[PDB]
Amino acid sequence: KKKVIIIGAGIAGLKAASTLHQNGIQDCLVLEARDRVGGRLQTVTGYQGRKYDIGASWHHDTLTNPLFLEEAQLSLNDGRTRFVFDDDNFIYIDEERGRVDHDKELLLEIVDNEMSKFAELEFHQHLGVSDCSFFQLVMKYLLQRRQFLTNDQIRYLPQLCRYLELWHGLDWKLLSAKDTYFGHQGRNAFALNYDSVVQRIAQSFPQNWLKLSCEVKSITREPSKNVTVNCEDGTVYNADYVIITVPQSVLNLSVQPEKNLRGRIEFQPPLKPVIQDAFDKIHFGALGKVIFEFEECCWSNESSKIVTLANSTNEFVEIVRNAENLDELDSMLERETSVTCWSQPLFFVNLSKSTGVASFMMLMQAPLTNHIESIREDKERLFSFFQPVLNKIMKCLDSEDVIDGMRPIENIANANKPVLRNIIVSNWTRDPYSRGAYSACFPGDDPVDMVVAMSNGQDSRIRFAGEHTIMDGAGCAYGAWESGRREATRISDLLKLEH
Amino acid sequence: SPAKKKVIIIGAGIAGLKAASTLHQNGIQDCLVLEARDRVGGRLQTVTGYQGRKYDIGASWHHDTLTNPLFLEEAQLSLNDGRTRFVFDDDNFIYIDEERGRVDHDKELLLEIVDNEMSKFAELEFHQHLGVSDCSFFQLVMKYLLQRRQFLTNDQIRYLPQLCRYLELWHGLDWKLLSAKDTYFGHQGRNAFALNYDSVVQRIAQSFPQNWLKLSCEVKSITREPSKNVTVNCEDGTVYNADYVIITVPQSVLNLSVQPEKNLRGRIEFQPPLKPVIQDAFDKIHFGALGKVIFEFEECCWSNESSKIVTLANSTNEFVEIVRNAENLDELDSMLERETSVTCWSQPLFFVNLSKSTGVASFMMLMQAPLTNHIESIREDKERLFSFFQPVLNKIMKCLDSEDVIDGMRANKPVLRNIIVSNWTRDPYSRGAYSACFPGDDPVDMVVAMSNGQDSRIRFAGEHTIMDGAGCAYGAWESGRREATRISDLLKLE
Ligand SMILES: Cc1cc2nc3c(=O)[nH]c(=O)nc-3n(C[C@H](O)[C@H](O)[C@H](O)COP(=O)(O)OP(=O)(O)OC[C@H]3O[C@@H](n4cnc5c(N)ncnc54)[C@H](O)[C@@H]3O)c2cc1C
Ligand SMILES: Cc1cc2nc3c(=O)[nH]c(=O)nc-3n(C[C@H](O)[C@H](O)[C@H](O)COP(=O)(O)OP(=O)(O)OC[C@H]3O[C@@H](n4cnc5c(N)ncnc54)[C@H](O)[C@@H]3O)c2cc1C
Ligand SMILES: NCCCCCCCCCCCCN
Ligand SMILES: NCCCCCCCCCCCCN
Q: What is the 3-state secondary structure (H, E, C) of chain A?
A: CEEEEEECCEHHHHHHHHHHHHCCCCCEEEEECCCCCECCCCEEECHHHCEEECCCCEECCCCCCHHHHHHHHHHHHHCCCCEECCCCCCEEEECCCEECCCCCCCCHHHHHHHHHHHHHHHHCCCCCCCCCEHHHHHHHHHHHHHHHCCHHHHHHHHHHHHHHHHHHCECCCCCEHHHHCCCCCCCCEEECCHHHHHHHHHCCCCHHHEEECCCEEEEEEECCCEEEEEECCCCEEEEEEEEECCCHHHHCCCCCCCCCCCCCCEEECCCCHHHHHHCCCCCCCCCEEEEEEECCCCCCCCCCEEEECCCCCHHHHHHHHHCCCHHHHHHHCCCCCCCCCCCCCEEEEEHHHHHCCCEEEEEECECHHHHHHHCCCCHHHHHHHHHHHHHHHHHHCCCCCCEECCCCCCCCCCCCCCEEEEEEECCCCCCCCCCCCCCCCCCCCCCHHHHHHHHCCCCCCEEECCCCCCCCCCCCHHHHHHHHHHHHHHHHHHHHCCC
Determine the Cα–Cα distance for residues A469 and A389; give it in Å rounded to an integer.
Answer: 38
Determine the Cα–Cα distance for residues A98 and A80; give it in Å rounded to an integer.
Answer: 40
* Residue environment code for B264-282, b if the CB has 16+ CB neighbours within 10 A, otherwise e: eebbbebeeebbeebeebb
Determine the Cα–Cα distance for residues B255 and B251; give it in Å rounded to an integer.
Answer: 6
Contact between A248 and A468 under an 8 Å Cβ cutoff? The reply is yes
Cis omega (within 30 of 0) for bond into B370 = yes
Nearest by Cα to A21 from A177, A176, A151, A210? A210
Spatial CB neighbours of A367, under 8 Å, sequence gap ≥ 6? A171, A174
The alpha carbons of chain B give a radius of gyration, in whole angstroms, of 24
**Partner-chain contact A302 B150, CB within 8 Å:** no
CB of B424 closer than 6 angstroms to any ligand 2 atom: yes
Contact between A54 and A160 under an 8 Å Cβ cutoff? The reply is no
Determine the Cα–Cα distance for residues A253 and A256; give it in Å rounded to an integer.
Answer: 5
A chain contacts of residue B91, beta-carbon cutoff 8 Å: 104, 107, 110
**Partner-chain contact B186 A117, CB within 8 Å:** yes
Determine the Cα–Cα distance for residues B229 and B223; give it in Å rounded to an integer.
Answer: 8
Phi, psi for residue B176 in degrees, rounded to 5? -95, -10
Secondary structure class of B334 (helix, strand, coil): helix
Helix or strand (DSSP H, E) at B17: helix B14-25
Say how many Å lie between the CA of residue A77 and the centre of ligand 2.
Answer: 57
Nearest by Cα to B468 from B123, B200, B183, B188? B188
Determine the Cα–Cα distance for residues B264 and B26; give it in Å rounded to an integer.
Answer: 36
Determine the Cα–Cα distance for residues B470 and A125; give it in Å rounded to an integer.
Answer: 21
Determine the Cα–Cα distance for residues B255 and B283; give it in Å rounded to an integer.
Answer: 10
Spatial CB neighbours of A205, under 8 Å, sequence gap ≥ 6? A17, A18, A20, A21
Secondary structure class of B283 (helix, strand, coil): coil
Contact between A345 and A388 under an 8 Å Cβ cutoff? The reply is no
Nearest by Cα to B56 from B35, B81, B87, B77? B87
Cα first-last separation, chain A: 17
Say how many Å lie between the CA of residue A382 and the centre of ligand 3.
Answer: 25
A chain contacts of residue B79, beta-carbon cutoff 8 Å: 147
Determine the Cα–Cα distance for residues A307 and A344; give it in Å rounded to an integer.
Answer: 10
Secondary structure class of B318 (helix, strand, coil): helix
Determine the Cα–Cα distance for residues A367 and A344; give it in Å rounded to an integer.
Answer: 10
Contact between B155 and B270 under an 8 Å Cβ cutoff? The reply is no
Contact between A360 and A350 under an 8 Å Cβ cutoff? The reply is yes
Determine the Cα–Cα distance for residues A364 and A54; give it in Å rounded to an integer.
Answer: 12
Contact between B328 and B138 under an 8 Å Cβ cutoff? The reply is no
Q: Which amino acid is at B37?
A: R
Q: In testing the pocket of ligand 3, which one of A248, A445, A476, A482 has its CB within 8 Å of the most ligand atoms?
A: A476
Query: Residue B470 CA: which ligand 4 atom is closest?
Result: 12
Contact between A453 and A425 under an 8 Å Cβ cutoff? The reply is no
Enumerate residues lining ligand 1, CB below 6 A: A 7-13, 31-34, 39-41, 55-58, 60, 215-216, 245-247, 250, 263, 265, 287-289, 426, 428, 433-434, 437-438, 466-467, 475-477, 480
Q: Which residues sit opposite B297 in a β-bridge?
A: B416
Shortest distance between the Cα of B291 and any Cα of chain A, in A, equals: 26
How do beta strands A189-191 and A210-212 pair?
A: unpaired
Q: In testing the pocket of ligand 1, which one of A19, A40, A42, A364 has its CB within 8 Å of the most ligand atoms?
A: A40
Spatial CB neighbours of B280, under 8 Å, sequence gap ≥ 6? B445
Secondary structure class of B413 (helix, strand, coil): coil
Spatial CB neighbours of A259, under 8 Å, sequence gap ≥ 6? A217, A218, A253, A266
Determine the Cα–Cα distance for residues B104 and B365; give it in Å rounded to an integer.
Answer: 19
Substitution target from A110, A154, A354 for chain B, most B beta carbons within 10 A = A110
Cα angle value A312/A335/A339 (rounded, 5°): 60
Nearest by Cα to B220 from B200, B241, B236, B203? B236
How do beta strands B291-297 and B415-421 pair?
A: antiparallel
A chain contacts of residue B75, beta-carbon cutoff 8 Å: 147-148
Contact between B214 and B33 under an 8 Å Cβ cutoff? The reply is yes
Determine the Cα–Cα distance for residues B41 and B18; give it in Å rounded to an integer.
Answer: 11
Q: Which amino acid is at A400?
A: E
Shortest distance between the Cα of A322 and any Cα of chain B, in A, equals: 15
Contact between A245 and A34 under an 8 Å Cβ cutoff? The reply is no
Q: What share of chain B is helix, strand, coil (3-state, %, to 5)?
A: 35, 20, 45
Half-sphere exposure of residue A101: CA atoms within 13 angstroms, side-chain side: 18
Cα first-last separation, chain B: 24
**Partner-chain contact A183 B66, CB within 8 Å:** no
Q: Note the resolution in Å, 1 decimal.
A: 2.3
Shortest distance between the Cα of A381 and any Cα of chain B, in A, equals: 35
What is the CB neighbour count within 10 angstroms for residue B80? 8
Determine the Cα–Cα distance for residues B149 and B141; give it in Å rounded to an integer.
Answer: 12
Cα angle value A289/A290/A293 (rounded, 5°): 140
Secondary structure class of B106 (helix, strand, coil): coil
A chain contacts of residue B189, beta-carbon cutoff 8 Å: 114, 117-118
Q: In testing the pocket of ligand 3, which one of A67, A163, A187, A438 has its CB within 8 Å of the most ligand atoms?
A: A438
Determine the Cα–Cα distance for residues B408 and B382; give it in Å rounded to an integer.
Answer: 11
- Domains, chain A, ordered by start: 1-84+189-282+433-499 (3.50.50.60), 85-188+283-432 (3.90.660.10)
Shortest distance between the Cα of B322 and any Cα of chain A, in A, equals: 19
Determine the Cα–Cα distance for residues B191 and B297; give it in Å rounded to an integer.
Answer: 25
Contact between A298 and A418 under an 8 Å Cβ cutoff? The reply is yes
Helix or strand (DSSP H, E) at B169: helix B168-171
Spatial CB neighbours of A491, under 8 Å, sequence gap ≥ 6? A4, A20, A25, A241, A243, A463
**Partner-chain contact B110 A88, CB within 8 Å:** yes
Shortest distance between the Cα of B149 and any Cα of chain A, in A, equals: 12
What is the CB neighbour count within 10 angstroms for residue A298? 19
Spatial CB neighbours of A122, under 8 Å, sequence gap ≥ 6? A137, A140
How do beta strands A236-244 and A51-53 pair?
A: unpaired
Spatial CB neighbours of B211, under 8 Å, sequence gap ≥ 6? none
**Partner-chain contact B150 A104, CB within 8 Å:** no
What is the CB neighbour count within 10 angstroms for residue A478? 24
